[PDB]
Amino acid sequence: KSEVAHRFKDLGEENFKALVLIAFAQYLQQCPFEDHVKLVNEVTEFAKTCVADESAENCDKSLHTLFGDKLCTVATLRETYGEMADCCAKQEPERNECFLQHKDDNPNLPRLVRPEVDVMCTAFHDNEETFLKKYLYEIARRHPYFYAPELLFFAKRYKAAFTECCQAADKAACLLPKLDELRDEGKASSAKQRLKCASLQKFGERAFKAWAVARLSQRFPKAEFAEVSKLVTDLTKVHTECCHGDLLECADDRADLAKYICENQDSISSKLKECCEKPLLEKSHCIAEVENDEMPADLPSLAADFVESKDVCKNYAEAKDVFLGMFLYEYARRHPDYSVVLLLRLAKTYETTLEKCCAAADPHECYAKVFDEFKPLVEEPQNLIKQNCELFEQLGEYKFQNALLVRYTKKVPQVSTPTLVEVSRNLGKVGSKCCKHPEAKRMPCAEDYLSVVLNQLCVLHEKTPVSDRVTKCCTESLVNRRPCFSALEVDETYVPKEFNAETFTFHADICTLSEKERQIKKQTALVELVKHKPKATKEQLKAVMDDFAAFVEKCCTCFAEEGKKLVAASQA
Numbered sequence: 001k002s003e004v005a006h007r008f009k010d011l012g013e014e015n016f017k018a019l020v021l022i023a024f025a026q027y028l029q030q031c032p033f034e035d036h037v038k039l040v041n042e043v044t045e046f047a048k049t050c051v052a053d054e055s056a057e058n059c060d061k062s063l064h065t066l067f068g069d070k071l072c073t074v075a076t077l078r079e080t081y082g083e084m085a086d087c088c089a090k091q092e093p094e095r096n097e098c099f100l101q102h103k104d105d106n107p108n109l110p111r112l113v114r115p116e117v118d119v120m121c122t123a124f125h126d127n128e129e130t131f132l133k134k135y136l137y138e139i140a141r142r143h144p145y146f147y148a149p150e151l152l153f154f155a156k157r158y159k160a161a162f163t164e165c166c167q168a169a170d171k172a173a174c175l176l177p178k179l180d181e182l183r184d185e186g187k188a189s190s191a192k193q194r195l196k197c198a199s200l201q202k203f204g205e206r207a208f209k210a211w212a213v214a215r216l217s218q219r220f221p222k223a224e225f226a227e228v229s230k231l232v233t234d235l236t237k238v239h240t241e242c243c244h245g246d247l248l249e250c251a252d253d254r255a256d257l258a259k260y261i262c263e264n265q266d267s268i269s270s271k272l273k274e275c276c277e278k279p280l281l282e283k284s285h286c287i288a289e290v291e292n293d294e295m296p297a298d299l300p301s302l303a304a305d306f307v308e309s310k311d312v313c314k315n316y317a318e319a320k321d322v323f324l325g326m327f328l329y330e331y332a333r334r335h336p337d338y339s340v341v342l343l344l345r346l347a348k349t350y351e352t353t354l355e356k357c358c359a360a361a362d363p364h365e366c367y368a369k370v371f372d373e374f375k376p377l378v379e380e381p382q383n384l385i386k387q388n389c390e391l392f393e394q395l396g397e398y399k400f401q402n403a404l405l406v407r408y409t410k411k412v413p414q415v416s417t418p419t420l421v422e423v424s425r426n427l428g429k430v431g432s433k434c435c436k437h438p439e440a441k442r443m444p445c446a447e448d449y450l451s452v453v454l455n456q457l458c459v460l461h462e463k464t465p466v467s468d469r470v471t472k473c474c475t476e477s478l479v480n481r482r483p484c485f486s487a488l489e490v491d492e493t494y495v496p497k498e499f500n501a502e503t504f505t506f507h508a509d510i511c512t513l514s515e516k517e518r519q520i521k522k523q524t525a526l527v528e529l530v531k532h533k534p535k536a537t538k539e540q541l542k543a544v545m546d547d548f549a550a551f552v553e554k555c556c557t558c559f560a561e562e563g564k565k566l567v568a569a570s571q572a
């Protein structure tokens with residue numbers, strides 16, 4: 001079975017010529033684009049010889065072998081990959097394992113910098129195949145562990161924005177907003193894939209399955225616990241393998257899970273019809289982002305089996321993870337409106353309760369009212385979402401972001417100004433995205449988007465530690481991470497920042513700037529305003545903000561004239 005030829009079929013020549021490009025670009029991050037093009041063309045030509053004759057020359061070697069063979073022929077030594085060239089002296093599965101250990105992950109590559117809209121649409125027109133292929137090359141060499149089929153999914157959406165906006169009226173009003181959402185979603189996926197690999201190693205796979213049972217029970221409410229438990233086991237085995245870095249081994253386990261799910265749709269979900277009729281690449285991908293199946297009508301209460309029962313301590317003791325997983329599965333399938341972390345708080349609370357009750361003379365009397373403990377935990381994110389979405393409606397996205405700047409700078413003023421501006425604007429975005437949902441779908445939307453922003457804040461703070469309270473909340477636990485950040489009181493031991501005079505100086509270049517960039521600096525100064533006087537309160541801050549609005553809108557030169565009056569007047 002010639003694997004290079006079989007891969008070429010059922011996957012398509014176009015997807016083959018793109019995955020081979022992403023694959024080699026993830027290893028040879030230093031080699032130029034045109035050098036990569038020949039290698040993809042050479043592998044494509046060689047694959048075509050195996051397509052025309054499966055038992056031809058060098059067509060009997062498997063995927064890792066021909067990959068490793070072609071990779072060890074590029075004068076890899078002395079060209080950055082000196083150590084990676086030493087992998088050639090090994091053989092499978094040591095040579096490929098050696099290749100994975102030498103992915104740079106942090107290559108000293110310049111910021112990509114997008115060209116002008118007219119330049120891109122012209123380059124996209126005159127040479128579309130070369131234009132898009134350079135896009136895959138430049139992104140794959142900077143994200144060496146980004147799952148290649150997933151990176152290919154973004155390339156299609158990248159091309160869809162160019163075909164529509166390049167033949168339009170105001171192209172920049174069409175293309176540029178699509179590219180930013182595309183680039184933002186690309187960073188979110190990259191950080192999500194890493195957060196899940198780090199969560200697997202830091203906290204162990206016992207807690208990883210708990211996250212998977214809850215999410216899968218919400219996704220597949222019409223599935224038995226045994227099916228959900230098997231899907232969680234296989235899904236964990238896939239993530240454990242895909243975090244090693246090997247694309248080929250990750251893809252095969254990822255395709256076997258989709259095949260099993262499509263063969264057992266009648267015992268998993270009713271919403272996997274059009275999902276399972278997609279090709280190999282999209283099948284595994286679409287199932288990951290599948291809508292929750294309809295909840296089974298007339299589901300009994302969890303009072304019977306988990307709090308009343310007759311004897312439940314015996315059931316919990318023999319399997320202190322299965323019985324907790326059955327409670328999590330039954331609670332999650334009934335509450336698709338809860339976040340995954342909320343359901344884990346209820347289970348962990350139900351866990352700590354049983355161990356204190358089953359360690360008592362009358363365990364039943366100890367756990368007789370365990371469900372009263374869940375009400376405060378369910379109402380805590382609900383009140384936070386409603387209090388913040390309502391404050392978002394009466395403010396708009398911008399003024400909601402500024403209310404978050406003041407609130408979070410006063411909590412941790414030690415955080416750098418560019419990080420406080422970035423995190424607060426992204427936290428305002430989850431308001432513009434999730435408050436447009438009803439209460440039945442607001443908590444999961446917030447959980448998914450907050451997990452992206454809160455992790456981005458942590459990885460920035462991890463590389464440059466600054467606050468102990470940010471460090472504790474960032475390394476506590478992924479279940480208690482959000483309640484940790486929301487429980488931060490304002491910093492009382494913080495000494496006010498010194499009045500840097502130039503920081504509050506503006507120069508009328510902000511008059512004609514950029515709607516984002518103009519308010520980036522308008523929000524940067526607001527952070528520096530709060531850092532200088534951390535005891536200003538909203539009334540005085542709304543006064544200085546109102547005084548700045550009249551100073552900026554009118555005097556737009558005078559920025560030094562009226563500016564000096566503002567600084568002295570604000571000193572109050």
Ligand SMILES: CCCCCCCCCCCCCCCCCC(=O)O
Nearest residue numbers: 147150193238239242254284287288
């Ligand atoms: C975001 C891209 C990650 C790439 C590696 C993913 C490895 C594991 C993904 C395999 C899942 C296949 C679909 C499983 C169906 C479960 C749906 C769900 O994830 O909630």
Ligand SMILES: *N1=[C]C2=[C][C]=[C][C]=C2N2[C]C3=[C][C]=[C][C]=C3[B@]21[O]
Nearest residue numbers: 195196199208211212215216239478
């Ligand atoms: N992702 C995500 C997350 C976060 C935190 C913790 C954990 C986790 N995990 C698990 C699962 C299941 C299903 C789907 C997805 C997922 B992940 O990986």
Ligand SMILES: CCCCCCCCCCCCCCCC(=O)O
Nearest residue numbers: 339381384385408446447482485486
């Ligand atoms: C910089 C500190 C960020 C703190 C984030 C507080 C934002 C609160 C908004 C409502 C939180 C909703 C969380 C739902 C998921 C969960 O149960 O934690």
